[PDB]
Design a protein around this ligand. Sequence first.
Ligand SMILES: NC(=O)C1=CN([C@@H]2O[C@H](COP(=O)(O)OP(=O)(O)OC[C@H]3O[C@@H](n4cnc5c(N)ncnc54)[C@H](O)[C@@H]3O)[C@@H](O)[C@H]2O)C=CC1
Ligand SMILES: NC(=O)C1=CN([C@@H]2O[C@H](COP(=O)(O)OP(=O)(O)OC[C@H]3O[C@@H](n4cnc5c(N)ncnc54)[C@H](O)[C@@H]3O)[C@@H](O)[C@H]2O)C=CC1
Ligand SMILES: NC(=O)C1=CN([C@@H]2O[C@H](COP(=O)(O)OP(=O)(O)OC[C@H]3O[C@@H](n4cnc5c(N)ncnc54)[C@H](O)[C@@H]3O)[C@@H](O)[C@H]2O)C=CC1
Ligand SMILES: NC(=O)C1=CN([C@@H]2O[C@H](COP(=O)(O)OP(=O)(O)OC[C@H]3O[C@@H](n4cnc5c(N)ncnc54)[C@H](O)[C@@H]3O)[C@@H](O)[C@H]2O)C=CC1
Ligand SMILES: O=P(O)(O)OC[C@H]1O[C@](O)(COP(=O)(O)O)[C@@H](O)[C@@H]1O
Ligand SMILES: O=P(O)(O)OC[C@H]1O[C@](O)(COP(=O)(O)O)[C@@H](O)[C@@H]1O
Lengths: 330, 328, 330, 328
Amino acid sequence: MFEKILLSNPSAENPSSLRPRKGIIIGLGQVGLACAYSMLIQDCFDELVLQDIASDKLEGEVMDFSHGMPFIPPTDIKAGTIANEGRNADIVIITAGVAQKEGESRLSLLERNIAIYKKILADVVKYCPEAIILVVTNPVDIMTYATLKITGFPSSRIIGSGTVLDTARFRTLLAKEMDIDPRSVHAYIIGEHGDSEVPVWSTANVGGMKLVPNTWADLPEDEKATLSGIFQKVQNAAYDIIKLKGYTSYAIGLATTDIVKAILNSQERILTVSGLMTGMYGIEDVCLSIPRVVSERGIIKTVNLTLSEDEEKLLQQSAKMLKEVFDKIN
Amino acid sequence: FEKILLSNPSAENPSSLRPRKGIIIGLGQVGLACAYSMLIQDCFDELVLQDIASDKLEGEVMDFSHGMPFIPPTDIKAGTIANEGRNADIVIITAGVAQKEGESRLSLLERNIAIYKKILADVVKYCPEAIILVVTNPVDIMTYATLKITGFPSSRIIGSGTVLDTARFRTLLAKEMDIDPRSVHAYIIGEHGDSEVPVWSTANVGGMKLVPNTWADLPEDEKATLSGIFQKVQNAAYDIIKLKGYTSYAIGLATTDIVKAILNSQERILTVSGLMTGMYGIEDVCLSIPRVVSERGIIKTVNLTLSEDEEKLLQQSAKMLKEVFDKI
Amino acid sequence: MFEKILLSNPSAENPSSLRPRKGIIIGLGQVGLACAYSMLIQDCFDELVLQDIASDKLEGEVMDFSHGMPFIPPTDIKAGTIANEGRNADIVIITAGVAQKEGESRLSLLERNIAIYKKILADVVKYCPEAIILVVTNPVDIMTYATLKITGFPSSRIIGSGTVLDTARFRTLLAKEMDIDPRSVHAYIIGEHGDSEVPVWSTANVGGMKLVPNTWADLPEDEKATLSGIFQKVQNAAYDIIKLKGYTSYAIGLATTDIVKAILNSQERILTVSGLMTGMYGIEDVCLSIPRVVSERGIIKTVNLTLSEDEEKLLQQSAKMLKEVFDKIN
Amino acid sequence: FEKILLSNPSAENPSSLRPRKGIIIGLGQVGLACAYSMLIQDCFDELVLQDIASDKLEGEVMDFSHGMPFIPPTDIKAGTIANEGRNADIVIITAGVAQKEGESRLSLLERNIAIYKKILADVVKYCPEAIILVVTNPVDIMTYATLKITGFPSSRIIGSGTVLDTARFRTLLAKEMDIDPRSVHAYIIGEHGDSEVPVWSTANVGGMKLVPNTWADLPEDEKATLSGIFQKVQNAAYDIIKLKGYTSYAIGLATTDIVKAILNSQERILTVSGLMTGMYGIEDVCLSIPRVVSERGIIKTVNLTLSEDEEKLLQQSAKMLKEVFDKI
Ligand SMILES: NC(=O)C1=CN([C@@H]2O[C@H](COP(=O)(O)OP(=O)(O)OC[C@H]3O[C@@H](n4cnc5c(N)ncnc54)[C@H](O)[C@@H]3O)[C@@H](O)[C@H]2O)C=CC1
Ligand SMILES: NC(=O)C1=CN([C@@H]2O[C@H](COP(=O)(O)OP(=O)(O)OC[C@H]3O[C@@H](n4cnc5c(N)ncnc54)[C@H](O)[C@@H]3O)[C@@H](O)[C@H]2O)C=CC1
Ligand SMILES: NC(=O)C1=CN([C@@H]2O[C@H](COP(=O)(O)OP(=O)(O)OC[C@H]3O[C@@H](n4cnc5c(N)ncnc54)[C@H](O)[C@@H]3O)[C@@H](O)[C@H]2O)C=CC1
Ligand SMILES: NC(=O)C1=CN([C@@H]2O[C@H](COP(=O)(O)OP(=O)(O)OC[C@H]3O[C@@H](n4cnc5c(N)ncnc54)[C@H](O)[C@@H]3O)[C@@H](O)[C@H]2O)C=CC1
Ligand SMILES: O=P(O)(O)OC[C@H]1O[C@](O)(COP(=O)(O)O)[C@@H](O)[C@@H]1O
Ligand SMILES: O=P(O)(O)OC[C@H]1O[C@](O)(COP(=O)(O)O)[C@@H](O)[C@@H]1O
């Protein structure tokens, strides 16, 4: 209808040099919906395809998302699959999978989530051969490494959300103690997105002023206790939140969107995303988070970060464990 | 951290700038979509969240606060009107029972008035100068009841009304033309419900009307295609609730869009719900018609010329709403 | 020294599906520098090339623009030419040329500016064959038509800024009388961006409520005088501003950026931009402004706008005189 | 248009929400870029512009207001502190004489103080609760002068300082590394000018320090390339002015950034110029140092540990800044 209101221009039949930026979110539960909402409000994509096995709920969600378009800049939001609507998408965001129950480790979701990815990744390889894959499903590091092995895509284009979320939690907790903007706190969490994560106290600072002036050993006992209490709240954040509301979604939706921005907008910005360890600290054949330059080609550079002897030993231990967990699943 | 940041004794006295505080009462599906959108779009300097389900609320506040490094900051916290929410500039009330599958918004009235009588007592005492933005259904009658209970000026008692219905109408028409919904200028007025009125007499894109003369002078095949679009707007809540169980995302954006016109003193035209004091011979009821929204609430009303049929339908919607409130 | 700080990733040697959005502004005087500032603050492009014959001033401007990057999201801003840095740019924004003096007509700049365009467009055809050209130089309508003839590009990809600016002025003046947001005033100015522009009083409205309820003739004499005073301020805006500060730049910089947003973000949004007339109201072989759908392929659709008999006659007269002005120069 | 929009009599009484008003005094190259940036980034609800060149200001206000439909609205107008600018929350002063090719910032002091004494008298009388943001060079000495003439709490008198120089420093370093300038965390502190100090001891990217131990340990080829980059930072204004006549765009974005931390109550760390009250044994002078900025001005000060050279360089800068103020 409306062909007498708008007259089509036959000159616009051939496509110009500009190609719309397409994104696809596979798995639309609590995490996938938070990602979709944030990515629409922040206008990341020109077209966004949503893929889920729960058809009815998905159809309802797409209706709700599309009704709010007049309040924000537009995005062609639709329900679809990689094989048709999601073909040649620039970024594939995979959140699909089982979430952890109360007191359940992320590591115990591995067998079930590899089974889910085997069904999904085959179509990503055939219909999106040039895409960046952004993995959110837990255990995030091992799911990123398995995606790399299954797809055979270049390691630069296989990125896990990793410790971007853990770093944001560390900064928020420290910023609450100082009553400042968390964007002014520069503190990192590296390694596994889980129990073996490593706080980089050696470089933690606000406005260039370090929180640990010399070494952790030279810190007073009362100060060591208050800083450890802050880190323990970061490692227990998922357990504490899941015990209260049943899951986590808002902060991961913003962390995932923040990574999509560095890629889409070719920003060359440093983020602690998960990716193949290919030499540093003697770590190999594994994925974990360390500061890296992120842009339209994925991981383009890695910060050659100087760590303390204790921080490096902890990172090495995190990697050996992650490799053993993947080896046991065969 | 007292040896890392040195406090300034000069900052003890408060400057002319007072932080913009907002409070959301009712953190269910709708309230949590409002909170998420309002944080990403940086509406408030401080935002208080109030709910009777303490544990779940504490978990939600933890989750919201962990994403702050990715956006500009807002002091997000759990609290009550009596303490943390004192003198908030805008009170957004979404608390209450939502409609089940096939249920009418109108049949949720007695249940939500009981909830409102408990909430509104504290708002009158601790936020006497606040704008109240009502989202709880039936939105028009909840807005009218809030006006009677609080006794606040009618300009400061606003319902979300048909801002959402107007956005749905524009999206459906824009999908048919494959254009930006912000380029479609079509309104839905009256009750946010079954008796809503599409203003076909003024619907247009770029000044070009969709109904060139009158609805009667339109071909039968065109009348059927336009009616199909309006029917999809009135059945939107029923169609979405049947698929996912509730609606949250579009109302979260509509509510945020109203808070932007107020906080930023924009003087922008929106079809929000508010007290009718005479227009089209309609009074002692709340419903949606285009109005200028700003920091003092409803500042002006568009003296909209309607067709004889559109005016009769609006009058019928009002009589119906008045009868629903009178029965309770 | 920084090669030991950041370690390059050999996997990122091959380019992904994502290609950075490149734009080039040719002519960086008052208008061009307002466009560059707005487009940087609003983060339109991934890379933006600036081209001008005044090399020294341009080098200084690029230094200034690049120093403010830490306060906004990044853009690779650089000085260059179409032949090297500007190769395969998605949008070419041309603001180069002579501006009108006090009391001077836009039409009298035609001959001089076509001479400037002939030199510039030769490289645009060779190095940017797939680009959208956005023309701002005066007389914007005849300059858009001449660009079409010189380049031979599809008419959908040759767009003039047209009456987007005039429409914004009309809306602001009417909104000041009502004390409302100009974005809530829906009033159009169509035709030539100049003295023969046409106010579409037949459709001017706020919230669906028309300002002229029936016809201009059925309006009271006092109302006819107040509405005419508002339109006369719109046609005299350039003269009034140029007489006070010497030129106009800020509003055209925002109008140009608003057009770039509809193209880059594939918005399909209605704007009164200048473009080739193909028989609407019997008008052909001329460029002028009428409401059109703008997107990544340029002008995709045209609003089949119903005009009053007087408004249509005025639009037809505007086109006959624009055609005669171009014919006299050839 | 009284028959188009009907005014609401309830909106006559004002609410707890009051519009954010800012005034820019001195609308030349710098002030015009502050205004354009602030309008596009929707900082204030009302923005008044003040300049002695009335006809030119009238032209700029017509131009700025014509672009309003493209961005969120702001009440832009020409006026004076005594009428349109009364009770401004933030007063931004960029008025004064700029430097020529090769002219030192400090020599502009004697002339600019005279200009300021006329302006500040009305700021004290009609905006007694305002934050004053000083841009006029020599910025540091004009900030201390503003602090002395007005008598306002030290927290409310803020200078643009080395926020701009810090942004240039990060940009030049990020150019070498081919990364986002927001990922480089390096500071320039002290006087905005020749005696500025680059904090090499704390310069880093992603936690990784640019100077691993001390400057003296650096290989001679590495310390020459680093010195080269700092030489380009201190000579940036000279190099730009010789090429285009003045600087406007980068300061326009730096001033807008300081204003964003104030209006939105962000508590963000910026290297702004302010009163030294004992840090490094330095007082009765104004210089840049990392500070917490919010709606009350300077709220806190980073107790930054500096290298022995960095500290001695910073205090020498302060001793000579207080000598220039005494010669007046
Ligand atoms: N990386 C991180 O920091 C975080 C990771 N997560 C992880 O994200 C995952 C998702 O968790 P939630 O969203 O909370 O739970 P959920 O149960 O709501 O989400 C899983 C969704 O995936 C869908 N799904 C399952 N198999 C599918 C398939 N083959 N194709 C498409 N869709 C399919 C389900 O229908 C459901 O909608 C979990 O593994 C969780 O541990 C959660 C939070 C943060
Ligand atoms: N105006 C509109 O266009 C729309 C209105 N709505 C309405 O908004 C309301 C919110 O519904 P949902 O979020 O979908 O349902 P929900 O059941 O998830 O949310 C209700 C929330 O209110 C809380 N609550 C109840 N009584 C309370 C009290 N006395 N004080 C504080 N908190 C209290 C509950 O604990 C719960 O968190 C419903 O009435 C629904 O019909 C829903 C969609 C659009
Ligand atoms: N369409 C509209 O609504 C508006 C159009 N304009 C028009 O924009 C044009 C430019 O205006 P202003 O900035 O005020 O003039 P201007 O004199 O400030 O700048 C024009 C610039 O063009 C450059 N230039 C000239 N020939 C060139 C070439 N071959 N290649 C590259 N650069 C070249 C000059 O070096 C100069 O910097 C004029 O034609 C003016 O009438 C101005 C305002 C609004
Ligand atoms: N890093 C920094 O903090 C920077 C400082 N500046 C300084 O900003 C100042 C202004 O620079 P520009 O805009 O380039 O120069 P400009 O000469 O174009 O601007 C000065 C303006 O102030 C007006 N003015 C003079 N006395 C006035 C009074 N009593 N009341 C109101 N208006 C008055 C003049 O009419 C003129 O429009 C200079 O002192 C310059 O050194 C400039 C750039 C960066
Ligand atoms: O606090 P600084 O050193 O001025 O840097 C501020 C910038 O740092 C960021 O927080 C980035 O931090 P990181 O690079 O440490 O992750 C930006 O979002 C912000 O604009
Ligand atoms: O299509 P137009 O007439 O240029 O109007 C564009 C403006 O219309 C709006 O959609 C508002 O429309 P309404 O006033 O009809 O609600 C703005 O958000 C947008 O900026």
